[PDB]
Ligand binder design. Structure first.
Ligand SMILES: [Ca+2]
Ligand SMILES: [Ca+2]
Length: 279
């Protein structure tokens, strides 16, 4: 399949080179996979989700995404137009309030929730969790992300937007999950992207067009935007049977575009998520 005039990030993950416009992807499109978007919620009624999104848990008064961030991330995972895995099932877990903030205890509870809830869902091709959030280092947050990964979920987490070593941020610093840095359309590390040895992979994160609340769309930037590219890619690859939740991060790193990025500090991987699609 080929989506013409795709958002640059989708084109980028299906190209060895920057600057293309078509997103090439296998038509399976993550069908049969599930991605939990642990964030401010998902506006599941957005037409771009095609009924494939649903809220499954909120830690606030409403399950509504009153912010947009979660909806945006979910759209990069799996919306029709803006998504990597256009046929995946999206499950929203609202751990962040409508200002985009959440207490670590709530974020931890949301991860534990996904680890259990997935056992109630039909996800024959596997389960991914996309965590476009983070704060300062917390062993308990890291442990929750590790538990979620151990439970059989492909956990992708944002490296953070501090232009600093992700070692000091969580869940970015949890080694066992897939810690995602951000790149821009010119294959530069995004100016805000964290870096460091704990990063596993980069994905498109600067000027990412996706869904927004109110049935809208907008372009925003962050490692929060790169993370769902990787989560979606994992779902897509898991549906193709190329990898499993436990190995998807390594598989994505092994199959990434290598050395394409600039402004990567020594000791940080120079790996950009790539679907290796061949028509
Ligand atoms: Ca290249
Ligand atoms: Ca890792």
């Amino acid at each position: 399949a080929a989506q013409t005039n795709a958002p640059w990030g989708l084109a980028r993950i299906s190209s060895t080179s920057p600057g293309t416009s078509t997103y090439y992807y296998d038509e399976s499109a993550g069908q049969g996979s599930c991605v939990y978007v642990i964030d401010t919620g998902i506006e599941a009624s957005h037409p771009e989700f095609e009924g494939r999104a649903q809220m499954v848990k909120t830690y606030y008064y409403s399950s509504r995404d009153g912010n947009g961030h979660g909806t945006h991330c979910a759209g990069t995972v799996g919306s029709r137009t803006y998504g990597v895995a256009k046929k995946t099932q999206l499950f929203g877990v609202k751990v962040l309030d409508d200002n985009g903030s959440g207490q670590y205890s709530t974020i931890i509870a949301g991860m534990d929730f996904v680890a259990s809830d997935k056992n109630n869902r039909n996800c024959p091709k596997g389960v991914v969790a996309s965590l476009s959030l983070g704060g300062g280092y917390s062993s308990s947050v890291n442990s929750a992300a590790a538990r979620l990964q151990s439970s059989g979920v492909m956990v992708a987490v944002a490296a953070g937007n501090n232009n600093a070593d992700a070692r000091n941020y969580s869940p970015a610093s949890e080694p066992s999950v897939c810690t995602v840095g951000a790149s821009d359309r010119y294959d530069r590390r995004s100016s805000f992207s964290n870096y460091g040895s704990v990063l596993d992979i980069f994905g498109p994160g600067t000027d990412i067009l996706s869904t927004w609340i109110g049935g809208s769309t907008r372009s925003i930037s962050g490692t929060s935007m790169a993370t769902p590219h990787v989560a979606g890619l994992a779902a897509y690859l898991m549906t193709l049977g190329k990898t499993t939740a436990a190995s998807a991060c390594r598989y994505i790193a092994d199959t990434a575009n290598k050395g394409d990025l600039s402004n990567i500090p020594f000791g940080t991987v120079n790996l950009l998520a790539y679907n290796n699609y061949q028509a």
